Amino acid sequence: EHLILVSQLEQLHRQGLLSLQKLWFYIQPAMRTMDILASLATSVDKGECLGGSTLSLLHDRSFSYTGDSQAQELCLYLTKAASAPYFEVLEKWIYRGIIHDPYSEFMVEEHEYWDQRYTIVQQQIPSFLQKMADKIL
Amino acid sequence: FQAFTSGLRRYLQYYRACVLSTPPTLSLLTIGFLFKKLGRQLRYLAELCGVAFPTGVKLLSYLYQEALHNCSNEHYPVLLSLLKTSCEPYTRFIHDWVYSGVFRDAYGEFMIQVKLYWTHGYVVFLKHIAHDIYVCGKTINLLKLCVLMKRSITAPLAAHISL
Q1: Which of A28, A55, B34, B81 has the most CB atoms within 10 Å of its CB?
Q2: Closest residue on chain B to A69 (Cα)
Q3: Dihedral, CA of residue B89, residue B91, residue B93 and residue B95, to nearest 10
Q4: Any signal peptide, and if so, which residues (chain A)?
């Protein structure tokens, strides 16, 4: 959607209707969206997050913008999309006992008399399931 | 204070939006006349802030008395849009004892802080509902161990107190 907002300008510029002062107005929204995605891509690079801790961050970076409504409708589109794969194994651990989780990222990992089989992992808790971190296991 | 600070920037951008929009190059005298009915309002906002300053409920009520003091004039919408968002987080605190009962505190902005079990000290908005909120919460916390017409607040509230 940013490769199109630069396509509409390369066509509107042919007709001469695009002065430099006119550019500094049209990109104003594309300067604010690309300034959120370049701040989540910074925290992930600086701090090793994979699995749950990369879903705790997208629930706090979405609460810090509790009064912007132009950068909260965004960070609520990322979290609502970066949590379906995590929530498709949770629907296999609650409604059945099987835990697929090929990459070690789910909150519950199995082992090989039963207090040691399945153990809650502390790092990979989404910090919005923290209240029910016990009823899941 | 943050929300009120976050509500103010929701206004200045409009002031930055109105400028750099209409005039490419107009007469010099046109500028002074155009920015008079609006410019003087900008200087009024200096009397409101400092440029000390209360916080917590003391600020959410101080800004309220600025409404009736200057109601009918052209300063009604701008102050209202501030008060409408300067009380946004405070409603959430109030939205705890009514729905969930998990008291939330950070620095003491709430007017209420935390055998007998009834030592949550308590001691503007209509006092007809003030003391009621104090008891509408302690009941939930006890079951867990076993024109300025304020109608947008009490109407979704009194319907839940009686139940």
Answers
A1: A55
A2: B10
A3: -130
A4: none
> For residues B118 and B140, what is the distance between their CA atoms, to the nearest angstrom?
13
φ and ψ of B128, to 5 deg: -60, -20
Residues of B in contact with A67 (CB under 8 A): 3, 6-7, 85, 88
Please give the Cα distance from B109 to A62 (Å, whole number). Answer: 23
Cα B49 from Cα A97, distance rounded (Å) = 60
Q: What values do phi and psi take at B155, rounded to 5?
A: -65, -50
- List the resolution, Å: 22.4
Pairwise CA distance, residues A53 & A57, whole Å: 6
Cβ contacts of A76 within 8 Å, gap of 6 or more: A62
Nearest Cα of chain A lies from the Cα of B134 at a distance, in angstroms, of 26
Residue A101 token pair: 């989780």
Q: Is A16 on the interface with B (CB under 8 A)?
A: no
Interface of A with B in 48-77 (CB under 8 A): 67
**CB–CB of A128/A59 below 8 Å?**
yes
The answer to whether the CB of B138 falls within 8 A of the CB of B144 is no
Q: What is the 3-state secondary structure (H, E, C) of A5-61?
A: HCHHHHHHCCCCCCCHHHHHHHCHHHHHHCCCHHHHHHHHHHCCCCCCHHHHHHHHC
Are B107 and B57 in contact, with CB atoms under 8 Å apart?
no
User: What is the nearest CA distance from A103 to chain B, expressed in angstroms?
Assistant: 37
Q: How was this structure determined?
A: cryo-EM
* Shortest Cα–Cα distance, B124 to chain A (Å): 25
